[PDB]
């Protein structure tokens, strides 16, 4: 599995160094350093999102360009860390205006349709297109929860939360008060949340068939980048989420599917 190989510490460090070298040393057709200008424009307008084109990444690193579409989570995390390091080197004071630099992947060679997604595409970086039909408001979501212990008043460390399950607390050093654990509102870190709904294009839908739809999740800078009735090109991680209600309804164990959005382009 590519996930196991990229999970290796030495492989992780090698990928980190390769991405740092790619960011620092990538000349253009005229020799200009593209990422210097990109980071300058990003920090000049107080953004926290850095776009990366897949074509030049493949041109300068084919191994990583092959690893990415198969393990899009850890690879993107390493890319984010390397980008943050490079930005901090270039702009030492940017730790005030931002706390995490995100990497957005553009021009992914593979393009699919909402009607041809099967279990083969699970946990893979896919690229689809469609028309937005629904857009909920921006709600806050728990990013890193800081559980406390009533037995000792000491507060446990951060616990990352995913969009697929409910995070549970760990173990206190010596007084094992697993039960009496709560959440404080002044140290927990939150993040923006928005769940859009995309459907097939009016022109591209088969006459005999009916339009299909899939749910997408937008977080952090991605929120409020779409409005209902807009044609978009969505790149994200196809993700599988259990839904017992559908199981009971259909009478057969079935799971819901959602897309964790990573890059959105409006055409």
């Amino acid at each position: 599995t590519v996930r196991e190989w990229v999970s290796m510490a030495a492989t992780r460090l090698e990928i980190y160094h390769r991405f740092k070298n790619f960011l620092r040393t990538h000349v253009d057709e005229h020799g200009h350093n593209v990422f210097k200008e990109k980071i300058s424009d990003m920090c000049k307008e107080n953004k926290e999102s850095l776009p990366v084109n897949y074509e030049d990444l493949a041109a300068r690193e084919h191994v990583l360009a092959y690893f990415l579409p198969e393990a899009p989570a850890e690879m993107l995390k390493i890319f984010d860390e390397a980008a943050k390091e490079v930005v901090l080197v270039m702009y030492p004071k940017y730790d005030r205006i931002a706390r995490e630099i995100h990497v957005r992947i553009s021009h992914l060679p593979l393009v699919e349709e909402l009607r041809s997604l099967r279990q083969l595409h699970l946990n893979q970086l896919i690229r689809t297109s469609g028309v937005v039909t629904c857009c909920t408001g921006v709600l806050p979501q728990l990013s890193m929860v800081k559980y406390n212990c009533n037995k000792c008043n000491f507060i446990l460390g951060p616990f990352f939360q995913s969009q697929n399950q409910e995070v549970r607390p760990g173990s206190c050093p010596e007084c094992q008060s697993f039960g009496p654990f709560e959440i404080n509102m002044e140290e927990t870190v939150y993040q923006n949340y928005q769940r859009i709904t995309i459907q097939e294009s009016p022109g591209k839908v088969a006459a005999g068939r009916l339009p299909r739809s899939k749910d997408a999740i937008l977080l952090a800078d991605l929120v409020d980048s779409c409005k209902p009735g807009d044609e978009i090109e969505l790149t994200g991680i196809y993700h599988n989420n259990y839904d017992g209600s559908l199981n009971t309804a259909n009478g057969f164990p079935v799971f819901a599917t959602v897309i964790l959005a990573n890059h959105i382009t409006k055409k």
């Binding site: 300058s40 920090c43 000049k44 307008e45 107080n46 702009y91 030492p92 004071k93 940017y94 005030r96 205006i97």
Partner: protein, 523 residues
């Protein structure tokens, strides 16, 4: 030429009825405040009447020529022969304390009525008495002596010295002297070296008065004036409105970064990013910004300015903190008082404009000071917009050796510049911005002659001119003499009511011939 002030000036007028005539400028107002403090302390009756121009000066002298004998004039009536125009008597004694250096020769050589309080240790080249009064050599000396109109030492400093000799000096008088000096600096009437020397002198006085000691300045209560020396930034009113607007509307930062152009805006954004301050905090009011961002603002601003080609971003000035919340800088007071003096919405009751300007300088009229600060912000924004409009649309034409620009009637905020000081400030700011923007080496060392529609009904346009900009200029201006000669040559209808000969009025009809004659004369 008066050598002693404790015996030849004060004691002469202690038991008499003085009449004070004060010209409309911040330095004159500060000197008047100090003189009023001394007079009220010594139980001396006086009458304070505003004087604006030569005609008003003559009329007001005629009104009170009999009721009073001793006359004191501040920042007026020293570059002309007052005796000939006023026609005074033997009893009348005129004390004159004015900053204009080209003093009239007749008033210099006279012991009857004109007892000049102007210091004799200044850079003044007095011509020989025998050469002038005892013939072509006399004309040569006249032309070599009255060529320029450079200003001199501050009146407020002389008043503070007079108070110091009498031991009746308080913190309130020192603050007024500081405000007068900073007013001279802001208008750019004194050289940088002279400003530094005067700042050193006032720093010595401040160190004398504010004799800090442990448990003496700790048990000392708040609400006592505490003037201190501060090496602060070169931004205008940056402690009242947001830092962003202060940067975008000043004169050093706007000219250096060429903020009138879009590339200037991009460079400004890069500068702010290099400093390391969020755009949200920078656009908020200075009193509501985060504490952490205001810890070492001066040093980081200086460094990031040094990277972006900005060197002289720090200047030496003073402060004041009389209470829990009140805290100002000298330039803030200068801008507020200047705005209150020259107002267009309050064009009615100009004497009341002077009254409000004078009242704003007391610690019991802070509300008027705040209104002055708001008006100064509006004035700065207006002059910045006008400068940008003039530069972008190329309304400045290099008509020979001197540049000529005319403000159209339909141009917004044109009524603000009918006033003299506003017009001068606009002229200097526009010249500096244009010099920073243009690339022609020859054009960078040329003077500017700005105009404005003074009065529509009579077809009179006000005209002004400033000396060419240079790294270390002598502040000497020859525009008055050239204007007068060109007016005589063209038989033009011009008026010299203002105490500065560089500012004259001119009819619309006589504009073209006057300009052509000036071009020919300066050639």
């Amino acid at each position: 030429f008066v050598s002693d002030l404790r015996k030849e000036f004060f004691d002469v007028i202690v038991t008499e009825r003085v009449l004070l005539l004060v010209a409309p400028d911040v330095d004159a107002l500060c000197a008047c405040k100090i003189l009023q403090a001394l007079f009220q302390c010594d139980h001396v009756q006086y009458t304070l009447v505003p004087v604006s121009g030569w005609q008003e000066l003559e009329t007001l002298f005629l009104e009170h020529k009999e009721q009073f004998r001793y006359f004191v004039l501040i920042n007026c009536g020293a570059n002309i022969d007052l005796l000939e125009t006023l026609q005074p008597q033997e009893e009348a004694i005129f004390y004159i304390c004015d900053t204009h250096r080209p003093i009239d020769v007749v008033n210099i050589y006279n012991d009857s009525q004109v007892k000049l309080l102007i210091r004799q240790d200044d850079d003044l080249e007095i011509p020989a008495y025998d050469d002038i009064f005892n013939e072509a050599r006399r004309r040569e000396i006249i032309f070599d002596y009255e060529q320029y109109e450079y200003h001199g030492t501050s009146s407020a400093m002389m008043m503070f010295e007079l108070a110091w000799i009498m031991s009746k000096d308080s913190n309130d008088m020192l603050w007024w002297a500081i405000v007068g000096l900073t007013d001279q600096w802001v208008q750019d009437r004194i050289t940088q070296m002279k400003y530094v020397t005067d700042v050193g002198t006032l720093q010595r006085h401040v160190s004398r008065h504010n004799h800090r000691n442990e448990d003496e300045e700790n048990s000392l209560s708040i609400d006592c004036m505490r003037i201190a020396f501060e090496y602060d930034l070169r931004l205008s009113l940056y402690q009242h409105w947001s830092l962003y607007e202060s940067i975008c509307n000043s004169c050093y930062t706007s000219a250096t970064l060429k903020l009138w152009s879009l590339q200037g805006q991009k460079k400004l954004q890069e500068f702010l990013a290099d400093m390391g301050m969020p755009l949200k905090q920078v656009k908020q009011k200075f009193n509501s910004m985060d504490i952490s961002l205001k810890e070492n603002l001066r040093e980081m601003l200086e460094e990031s300015a040094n990277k972006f080609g900005m060197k002289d971003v720090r200047v030496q000035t003073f402060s004041v903190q009389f209470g829990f919340k009140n805290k100002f800088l000298a330039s803030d007071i200068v801008f507020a008082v200047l705005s209150l003096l020259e107002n267009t919405e309050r064009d009615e009751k100009g004497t009341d404009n002077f009254i409000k300007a004078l009242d704003s300088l007391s610690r019991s009229n802070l509300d008027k000071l705040h209104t002055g600060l708001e008006m100064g912000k509006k004035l700065l924004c207006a002059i910045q917009q006008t400068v940008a409009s003039c530069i972008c649309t190329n309304l400045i034409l290099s008509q020979g050796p001197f540049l000529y620009c005319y403000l159209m009637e339909g141009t917004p905020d044109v009524k603000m510049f009918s006033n003299p000081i506003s017009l001068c400030l606009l002229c200097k700011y526009l010249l500096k911005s244009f010099v920073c923007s243009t690339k022609n080496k020859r054009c960078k060392l040329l003077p500017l002659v700005l105009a404005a529609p003074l009065d529509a009904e009579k077809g009179t346009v006000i005209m002004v001119g400033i000396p060419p900009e240079a790294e270390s200029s002598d502040k000497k201006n020859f525009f008055g003499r050239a204007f007068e000669k060109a007016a005589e040559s063209t038989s033009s209808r011009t008026l010299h009511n203002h105490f500065d000969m560089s500012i004259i009025e001119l009819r619309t009809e006589d504009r073209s011939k006057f300009l052509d004659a000036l071009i020919s004369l300066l050639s």
